[PDB]
Short mmCIF file of C-alpha atoms in Angstrom, two decimals:
data_model
loop_
_atom_site.label_atom_id
_atom_site.label_comp_id
_atom_site.label_asym_id
_atom_site.label_seq_id
_atom_site.Cartn_x
_atom_site.Cartn_y
_atom_site.Cartn_z
CA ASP V 49 -21.69 6.02 -39.57
CA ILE V 50 -24.36 5.75 -36.89
CA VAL V 51 -22.73 8.03 -34.35
CA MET V 52 -23.19 7.11 -30.67
CA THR V 53 -22.65 9.87 -28.12
CA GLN V 54 -22.73 10.11 -24.32
CA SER V 55 -23.00 13.33 -22.32
CA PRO V 56 -21.59 12.21 -18.92
CA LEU V 57 -17.91 11.38 -18.76
CA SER V 58 -16.98 10.71 -15.11
CA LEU V 59 -18.82 10.57 -11.80
CA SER V 60 -18.50 9.28 -8.24
CA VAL V 61 -21.56 7.39 -6.98
CA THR V 62 -22.16 5.52 -3.74
CA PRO V 63 -23.58 1.97 -3.88
CA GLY V 64 -27.35 1.65 -4.00
CA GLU V 65 -27.80 4.92 -5.90
CA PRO V 66 -29.78 5.18 -9.16
CA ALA V 67 -27.70 6.41 -12.11
CA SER V 68 -29.14 7.00 -15.58
CA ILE V 69 -27.36 7.51 -18.92
CA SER V 70 -28.86 8.15 -22.35
CA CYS V 71 -27.21 7.55 -25.73
CA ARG V 72 -28.49 9.08 -28.98
CA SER V 73 -28.34 8.04 -32.62
CA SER V 74 -27.31 10.16 -35.60
CA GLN V 75 -28.24 7.70 -38.38
CA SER V 76 -30.54 4.75 -39.00
CA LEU V 77 -30.65 2.08 -36.29
CA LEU V 78 -30.74 -0.80 -38.80
CA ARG V 79 -28.34 -3.67 -38.07
CA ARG V 80 -27.33 -6.84 -39.87
CA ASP V 81 -30.23 -8.59 -38.12
CA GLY V 82 -32.40 -5.45 -38.25
CA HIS V 83 -32.26 -4.56 -34.53
CA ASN V 84 -31.05 -1.26 -33.09
CA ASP V 85 -27.35 -0.55 -33.53
CA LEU V 86 -26.61 0.39 -29.92
CA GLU V 87 -24.79 -1.97 -27.57
CA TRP V 88 -24.23 -0.92 -23.95
CA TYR V 89 -20.90 -1.55 -22.25
CA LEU V 90 -19.32 -1.45 -18.79
CA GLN V 91 -15.58 -1.35 -18.19
CA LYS V 92 -14.15 -3.90 -15.75
CA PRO V 93 -10.65 -3.97 -14.21
CA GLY V 94 -8.13 -6.24 -15.85
CA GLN V 95 -10.07 -6.40 -19.13
CA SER V 96 -12.06 -4.43 -21.69
CA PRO V 97 -15.63 -3.15 -21.25
CA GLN V 98 -18.19 -5.95 -21.45
CA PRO V 99 -21.47 -5.78 -23.40
CA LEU V 100 -24.57 -4.94 -21.39
CA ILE V 101 -27.56 -4.45 -23.73
CA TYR V 102 -27.32 -5.20 -27.45
CA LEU V 103 -30.02 -4.92 -30.15
CA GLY V 104 -30.98 -1.63 -28.47
CA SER V 105 -34.68 -2.34 -27.89
CA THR V 106 -34.03 -5.90 -26.65
CA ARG V 107 -32.80 -6.46 -23.10
CA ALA V 108 -30.01 -9.02 -23.13
CA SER V 109 -30.69 -12.23 -21.23
CA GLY V 110 -28.90 -12.67 -17.92
CA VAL V 111 -28.58 -8.90 -17.40
CA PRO V 112 -29.90 -7.84 -13.96
CA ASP V 113 -32.48 -5.14 -13.42
CA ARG V 114 -29.70 -2.67 -12.53
CA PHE V 115 -28.97 -2.09 -16.23
CA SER V 116 -32.10 -1.10 -18.16
CA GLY V 117 -32.22 -1.69 -21.90
CA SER V 118 -35.60 -0.06 -22.54
CA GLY V 119 -34.16 2.48 -24.98
CA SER V 120 -35.64 2.19 -28.47
CA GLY V 121 -35.47 4.23 -31.64
CA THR V 122 -32.88 6.96 -32.07
CA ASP V 123 -32.83 7.74 -28.35
CA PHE V 124 -31.88 5.21 -25.67
CA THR V 125 -32.10 4.96 -21.90
CA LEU V 126 -29.79 3.01 -19.59
CA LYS V 127 -30.05 3.03 -15.81
CA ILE V 128 -28.01 1.76 -12.87
CA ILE V 129 -30.65 0.83 -10.30
CA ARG V 130 -28.10 -0.07 -7.62
CA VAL V 131 -24.35 0.50 -7.72
CA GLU V 132 -21.86 -2.21 -6.75
CA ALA V 133 -18.25 -1.76 -5.69
CA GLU V 134 -17.30 -3.94 -8.68
CA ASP V 135 -19.34 -1.87 -11.16
CA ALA V 136 -16.70 0.88 -11.40
CA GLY V 137 -15.80 1.54 -15.01
CA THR V 138 -16.56 3.41 -18.21
CA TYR V 139 -19.79 2.95 -20.17
CA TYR V 140 -19.85 2.66 -23.97
CA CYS V 141 -22.71 2.86 -26.45
CA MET V 142 -21.72 1.88 -29.99
CA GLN V 143 -23.05 0.73 -33.35
CA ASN V 144 -22.05 -2.70 -34.61
CA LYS V 145 -23.48 -3.13 -38.14
CA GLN V 146 -21.62 -0.87 -40.56
CA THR V 147 -17.93 -0.06 -41.01
CA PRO V 148 -17.26 3.02 -38.81
CA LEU V 149 -17.96 1.64 -35.33
CA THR V 150 -18.85 4.81 -33.41
CA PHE V 151 -18.44 4.46 -29.64
CA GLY V 152 -19.92 6.79 -27.05
CA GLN V 153 -17.76 9.33 -25.27
CA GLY V 154 -17.78 7.06 -22.22
CA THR V 155 -18.72 7.67 -18.58
CA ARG V 156 -16.11 6.40 -16.13
CA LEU V 157 -17.55 5.35 -12.77
CA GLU V 158 -15.66 5.54 -9.49
CA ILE V 159 -17.05 4.18 -6.22
CA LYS V 160 -17.36 6.67 -3.34
CA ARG V 161 -15.57 5.31 -0.24
CA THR V 162 -14.45 6.83 3.04
CA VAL V 163 -11.07 8.52 3.29
CA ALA V 164 -8.41 6.27 4.84
CA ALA V 165 -4.83 6.85 5.95
CA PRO V 166 -2.29 4.78 3.99
CA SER V 167 0.54 2.92 5.69
CA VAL V 168 4.24 3.45 4.96
CA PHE V 169 6.64 0.56 4.23
CA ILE V 170 9.89 1.93 2.83
CA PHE V 171 12.55 -0.36 1.37
CA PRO V 172 16.23 0.57 1.08
CA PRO V 173 17.72 0.07 -2.40
CA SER V 174 19.43 -3.26 -2.95
CA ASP V 175 23.21 -3.20 -3.33
CA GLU V 176 22.84 -5.32 -6.47
CA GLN V 177 21.17 -2.42 -8.27
CA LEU V 178 23.92 -0.11 -7.00
CA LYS V 179 26.36 -2.34 -8.91
CA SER V 180 24.31 -1.57 -12.03
CA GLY V 181 24.93 2.18 -11.64
CA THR V 182 21.28 2.96 -10.81
CA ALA V 183 19.29 3.24 -7.59
CA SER V 184 15.69 2.66 -6.55
CA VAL V 185 14.18 3.80 -3.25
CA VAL V 186 10.78 2.18 -2.69
CA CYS V 187 8.21 4.10 -0.64
CA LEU V 188 4.99 2.12 -0.25
CA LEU V 189 1.47 3.40 0.40
CA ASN V 190 -1.41 0.97 0.83
CA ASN V 191 -5.21 0.78 0.89
CA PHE V 192 -6.15 4.46 0.85
CA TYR V 193 -9.35 5.74 -0.75
CA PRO V 194 -8.32 9.15 -2.20
CA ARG V 195 -6.31 8.35 -5.33
CA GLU V 196 -5.61 12.07 -5.78
CA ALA V 197 -2.21 12.52 -4.13
CA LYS V 198 1.16 14.04 -4.96
CA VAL V 199 4.54 12.39 -4.35
CA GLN V 200 7.74 14.35 -3.81
CA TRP V 201 11.10 12.58 -4.14
CA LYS V 202 13.20 14.92 -2.00
CA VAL V 203 16.83 13.78 -2.25
CA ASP V 204 18.61 15.30 0.76
CA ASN V 205 15.48 17.43 1.19
CA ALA V 206 15.68 18.49 -2.49
CA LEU V 207 12.78 17.44 -4.71
CA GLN V 208 13.75 15.95 -8.08
CA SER V 209 11.47 15.45 -11.08
CA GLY V 210 11.53 13.87 -14.51
CA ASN V 211 13.21 10.61 -13.49
CA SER V 212 11.27 9.38 -10.45
CA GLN V 213 7.48 9.03 -10.61
CA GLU V 214 4.62 7.27 -8.85
CA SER V 215 2.60 4.09 -9.40
CA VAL V 216 -0.95 3.77 -8.05
CA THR V 217 -3.12 0.66 -8.29
CA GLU V 218 -6.85 0.79 -8.97
CA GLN V 219 -9.73 0.28 -6.53
CA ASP V 220 -9.32 -2.93 -4.55
CA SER V 221 -11.87 -5.72 -4.73
CA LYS V 222 -12.00 -6.08 -0.96
CA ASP V 223 -12.42 -2.42 0.04
CA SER V 224 -11.98 -0.21 -3.09
CA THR V 225 -8.97 1.61 -1.65
CA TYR V 226 -6.05 2.57 -3.88
CA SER V 227 -2.41 1.82 -3.09
CA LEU V 228 0.52 4.03 -4.09
CA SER V 229 4.16 3.17 -4.78
CA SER V 230 6.92 5.50 -5.94
CA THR V 231 10.49 4.71 -6.97
CA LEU V 232 13.44 7.10 -6.93
CA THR V 233 15.63 6.54 -9.99
CA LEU V 234 19.13 7.95 -9.52
CA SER V 235 22.41 7.26 -11.30
CA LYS V 236 25.44 6.06 -9.38
CA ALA V 237 27.21 9.39 -9.94
CA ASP V 238 24.20 11.19 -8.48
CA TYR V 239 23.82 8.46 -5.85
CA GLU V 240 27.28 9.07 -4.40
CA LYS V 241 26.67 12.83 -4.52
CA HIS V 242 23.70 12.44 -2.15
CA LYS V 243 23.69 10.88 1.32
CA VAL V 244 20.13 10.90 2.74
CA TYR V 245 17.22 9.81 0.54
CA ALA V 246 13.66 10.69 1.49
CA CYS V 247 10.18 9.94 0.13
CA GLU V 248 7.43 12.54 0.53
CA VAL V 249 3.79 11.88 -0.39
CA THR V 250 1.13 14.55 0.11
CA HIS V 251 -2.22 12.81 0.57
CA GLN V 252 -5.62 14.01 1.71
CA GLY V 253 -5.96 11.05 4.07
CA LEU V 254 -2.57 11.87 5.57
CA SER V 255 -2.82 14.63 8.16
CA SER V 256 0.86 15.30 7.43
CA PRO V 257 3.15 13.58 4.91
CA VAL V 258 5.09 10.67 6.38
CA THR V 259 8.74 10.47 5.30
CA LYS V 260 11.30 7.73 5.91
CA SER V 261 14.98 8.43 5.24
CA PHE V 262 17.95 6.17 4.53
CA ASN V 263 21.59 7.17 4.87
CA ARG V 264 23.79 6.18 1.94
CA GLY V 265 25.50 2.87 2.65
CA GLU V 266 22.77 1.40 4.86
CA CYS V 267 22.85 -1.86 2.90
CA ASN Z 160 17.17 18.19 51.03
CA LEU Z 161 20.27 15.99 51.35
CA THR Z 162 21.08 17.10 54.90
CA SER Z 163 22.02 13.68 56.31
CA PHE Z 164 22.79 10.09 55.33
CA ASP Z 165 19.25 8.74 55.52
CA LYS Z 166 18.01 11.28 52.97
CA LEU Z 167 20.47 9.90 50.40
CA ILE Z 168 18.37 6.76 49.95
CA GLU Z 169 15.23 8.90 49.83
CA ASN Z 170 16.44 11.17 46.99
CA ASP Z 171 18.00 8.36 44.88
CA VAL Z 172 21.59 9.63 44.72
CA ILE Z 173 24.40 7.81 42.91
CA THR Z 174 28.07 8.64 43.34
CA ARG Z 175 30.02 10.07 40.41
CA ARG Z 176 33.22 8.12 41.07
CA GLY Z 177 32.55 5.13 38.82
CA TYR Z 178 29.40 6.27 36.99
CA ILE Z 179 30.72 9.56 35.58
CA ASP Z 180 28.19 9.27 32.76
CA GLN Z 181 25.75 12.18 32.50
CA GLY Z 182 23.67 10.62 29.71
CA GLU Z 183 21.69 7.38 29.72
CA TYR Z 184 22.69 3.78 30.37
CA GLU Z 185 21.01 2.29 27.31
CA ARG Z 186 19.22 -1.03 27.67
CA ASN Z 187 21.06 -4.07 26.32
CA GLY Z 188 24.41 -2.56 27.21
CA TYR Z 189 27.64 -4.03 28.57
CA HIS Z 190 27.33 -2.19 31.88
CA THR Z 191 29.12 -3.50 34.96
CA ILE Z 192 28.64 -2.39 38.56
CA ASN Z 193 31.53 -0.87 40.48
CA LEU Z 194 32.40 -2.32 43.87
CA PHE Z 195 33.60 0.74 45.78
CA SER Z 196 31.22 3.26 44.18
CA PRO Z 197 28.19 3.51 46.52
CA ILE Z 198 24.69 3.51 45.06
CA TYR Z 199 22.47 4.84 47.84
CA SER Z 200 19.44 4.72 45.53
CA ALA Z 201 16.67 2.23 46.25
CA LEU Z 202 15.01 3.38 43.04
CA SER Z 203 12.50 0.98 41.52
CA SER Z 204 10.14 1.54 38.62
CA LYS Z 205 6.42 1.61 39.36
CA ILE Z 206 6.18 0.11 35.86
CA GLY Z 207 7.45 -3.38 35.25
CA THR Z 208 11.04 -2.74 34.09
CA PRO Z 209 13.88 -1.73 36.47
CA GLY Z 210 16.62 -0.90 33.96
CA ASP Z 211 20.22 -2.02 33.81
CA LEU Z 212 22.37 -0.55 36.58
CA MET Z 213 19.59 -0.44 39.15
CA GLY Z 214 18.60 -3.88 37.89
CA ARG Z 215 22.02 -5.45 38.51
CA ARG Z 216 22.50 -3.62 41.82
CA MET Z 217 19.11 -4.70 43.15
CA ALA Z 218 19.66 -8.27 41.93
CA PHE Z 219 22.97 -8.52 43.77
CA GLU Z 220 21.51 -6.89 46.89
CA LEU Z 221 18.63 -9.38 46.84
CA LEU Z 222 21.07 -12.26 46.38
CA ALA Z 223 22.82 -10.94 49.47
CA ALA Z 224 19.57 -10.68 51.44
CA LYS Z 225 17.98 -13.92 50.20
CA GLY Z 226 19.32 -17.06 48.54
CA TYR Z 227 19.73 -17.79 44.84
CA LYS Z 228 16.52 -19.79 44.41
CA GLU Z 229 14.26 -17.20 46.09
CA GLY Z 230 15.60 -13.76 45.36
CA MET Z 231 17.64 -12.73 42.32
CA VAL Z 232 15.91 -15.32 40.12
CA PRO Z 233 12.41 -14.10 41.12
CA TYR Z 234 13.69 -10.54 40.66
CA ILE Z 235 14.66 -11.28 37.06
CA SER Z 236 13.03 -14.43 35.74
CA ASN Z 237 9.38 -13.59 34.86
CA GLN Z 238 8.70 -16.24 37.51
CA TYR Z 239 5.83 -14.19 38.89
CA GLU Z 240 4.71 -13.19 35.38
CA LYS Z 241 1.93 -15.79 35.56
CA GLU Z 242 0.79 -14.48 38.94
CA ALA Z 243 1.18 -10.87 37.82
CA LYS Z 244 -0.97 -11.64 34.77
CA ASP Z 245 -3.53 -13.32 37.03
CA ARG Z 246 -3.61 -10.21 39.24
CA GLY Z 247 -3.91 -8.10 36.08
CA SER Z 248 -1.24 -5.93 34.44
CA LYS Z 249 -2.11 -7.35 31.02
CA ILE Z 250 -0.01 -6.14 28.10
CA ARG Z 251 0.37 -6.89 24.40
CA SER Z 252 3.81 -7.04 22.79
CA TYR Z 253 4.87 -8.33 19.37
CA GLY Z 254 1.24 -8.99 18.51
CA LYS Z 255 0.56 -11.24 21.50
CA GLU Z 256 -0.82 -10.63 24.98
CA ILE Z 257 1.51 -11.37 27.88
CA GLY Z 258 1.67 -10.63 31.58
CA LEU Z 259 3.77 -7.86 33.11
CA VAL Z 260 5.60 -8.19 36.43
CA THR Z 261 6.50 -4.99 38.28
CA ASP Z 262 9.11 -4.09 40.89
CA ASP Z 263 6.50 -3.56 43.60
CA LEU Z 264 5.02 -6.97 42.80
CA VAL Z 265 8.32 -8.83 43.13
CA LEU Z 266 9.04 -6.86 46.30
CA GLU Z 267 5.71 -7.99 47.75
CA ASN Q 130 -12.96 -20.44 -38.60
CA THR Q 131 -10.42 -17.61 -38.73
CA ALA Q 132 -10.32 -13.96 -39.82
CA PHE Q 133 -7.34 -11.96 -41.06
CA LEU Q 134 -6.01 -8.55 -40.07
CA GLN Q 135 -2.93 -7.27 -41.91
CA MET Q 136 -0.73 -4.51 -40.47
CA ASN Q 137 1.90 -2.78 -42.60
CA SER Q 138 4.38 0.10 -42.20
CA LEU Q 139 4.31 -0.08 -38.41
CA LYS Q 140 4.75 3.06 -36.32
CA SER Q 141 4.80 3.92 -32.63
CA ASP Q 142 1.25 5.29 -32.86
CA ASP Q 143 0.08 1.85 -34.04
CA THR Q 144 0.70 0.34 -30.58
CA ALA Q 145 -2.78 -0.40 -29.25
CA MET Q 146 -5.04 -2.98 -27.60
CA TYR Q 147 -6.28 -4.56 -30.82
CA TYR Q 148 -9.74 -6.20 -30.63
CA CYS Q 149 -11.25 -8.50 -33.20
CA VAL Q 150 -14.93 -8.78 -32.29
CA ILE Q 151 -17.96 -10.69 -33.58
CA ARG Q 152 -21.01 -8.65 -34.61
CA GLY Q 153 -24.19 -8.98 -36.64
CA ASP Q 154 -25.05 -12.26 -34.91
CA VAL Q 155 -27.51 -13.09 -32.13
CA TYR Q 156 -26.14 -16.64 -31.86
CA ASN Q 157 -22.59 -15.53 -30.97
CA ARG Q 158 -21.74 -12.42 -28.96
CA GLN Q 159 -18.99 -13.72 -26.67
CA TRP Q 160 -16.60 -10.88 -25.89
CA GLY Q 161 -13.12 -11.54 -27.25
CA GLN Q 162 -9.92 -10.97 -25.31
CA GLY Q 163 -8.16 -9.11 -28.14
CA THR Q 164 -4.39 -8.88 -28.46
CA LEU Q 165 -1.52 -6.63 -27.36
CA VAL Q 166 0.69 -5.21 -30.11
CA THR Q 167 3.59 -3.00 -29.03
CA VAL Q 168 5.47 -1.23 -31.83
CA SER Q 169 9.06 -0.39 -30.93
CA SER Q 170 12.39 -1.46 -32.42
CA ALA Q 171 13.77 -2.24 -28.96
CA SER Q 172 14.24 -5.95 -28.36
CA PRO Q 173 12.49 -7.48 -25.33
CA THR Q 174 14.69 -7.09 -22.25
CA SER Q 175 14.74 -9.49 -19.33
CA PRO Q 176 13.73 -7.78 -16.07
CA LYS Q 177 16.33 -7.01 -13.41
CA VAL Q 178 14.85 -8.85 -10.43
CA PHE Q 179 15.91 -7.14 -7.19
CA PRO Q 180 14.84 -8.96 -3.99
CA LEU Q 181 14.31 -5.99 -1.70
CA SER Q 182 14.20 -6.81 2.01
CA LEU Q 183 12.66 -4.88 4.90
CA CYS Q 184 15.98 -3.88 6.46
CA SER Q 185 14.15 -1.45 8.74
CA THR Q 186 11.87 -2.56 11.55
CA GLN Q 187 9.00 -4.85 10.57
CA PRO Q 188 5.32 -4.27 11.38
CA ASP Q 189 4.26 -5.34 14.85
CA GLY Q 190 2.23 -8.37 13.77
CA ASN Q 191 3.28 -8.80 10.14
CA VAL Q 192 6.43 -9.15 8.05
CA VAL Q 193 6.53 -7.16 4.81
CA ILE Q 194 8.68 -8.39 1.91
CA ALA Q 195 8.74 -6.75 -1.52
CA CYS Q 196 9.87 -7.90 -4.97
CA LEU Q 197 11.22 -5.28 -7.36
CA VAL Q 198 11.77 -5.74 -11.10
CA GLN Q 199 13.16 -3.12 -13.46
CA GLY Q 200 14.54 -2.73 -16.96
CA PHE Q 201 12.01 -4.91 -18.79
CA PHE Q 202 10.87 -3.54 -22.14
CA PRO Q 203 7.66 -5.42 -23.06
CA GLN Q 204 4.62 -4.64 -20.91
CA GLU Q 205 2.63 -7.71 -22.02
CA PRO Q 206 1.80 -10.03 -19.12
#
């Protein structure tokens, strides 16, 4: 009923930078206890977003000065006085009294780190999987900042799509650098058709894509 | 330049009779040394590895010139590796620092 | 000390990260962990554990070993 909305949706901010977000109200702010309906939230890896400032006009105890819960009335004001590498996530404002819990649009936060060159650790497919009629070439990329990258599974220098895709972790706790892994899924009939298997990943950190190739029957 | 015998040692010439190979004698290879095929080359690497064929030939020549205890074993034993490392020539291999002994060093 | 949620006529769109939460109270606002409900007629499938080894050359100062699992239906932990 009490619709909560957020204008920003995604942004990259360096640590120690002030960020401000405002959430508005479309209906009465009355709650079960009478306080304002809004409850601030911050998404954390491995879990759901956690509450930041509930009751709207009351700043929750134990919340640092970074998050400001001074918003009162229909309009609200939340700040991020300093940014931490572990504060990356999406921010929700929502009403918690009535039936239709209306969450804000959400503002995902990503931490701005320096571009790094990932390392390559390829793994030849195990012969046990070959006995199952399928194949899996593992091409590993580690601890790189720019998550935006494209992976090409060129089988005998021929890119294939729709069966083999990529897997990228989130920002690391130690250095907030993503890691990428892609697996080439090929049937045994297609596996015997093709001899050399190559992994190609186009990454901004990479000056040129690094490709490792395995001849069929290496294992 | 090969106008006389003495220049043969200078220009590092090896006869074709037993070493017909025109490629490379890869390291860690089952390479023997022919008896009647002359190797006029006194070639030694200014860096601390002499190779295979030159390595074996120089080791046998040193064993001829000097005994087994001094000569041959000092040529290939890293015996002077501690003294080479003391003089310098530091190097890191397999994630650990280690000395490097060079042909000129063992010759000296 | 329990609350009930009843789900009927399950469909693939119903797969979600379901959260029961406590509201309207200043004495209790601990954030719940929720539950994972995956809606698909496929039975859970044991993963195919493939112990991949670094057959190629290893890093200079480190040894890299990877564990690969495939063909497991349920994504819960």
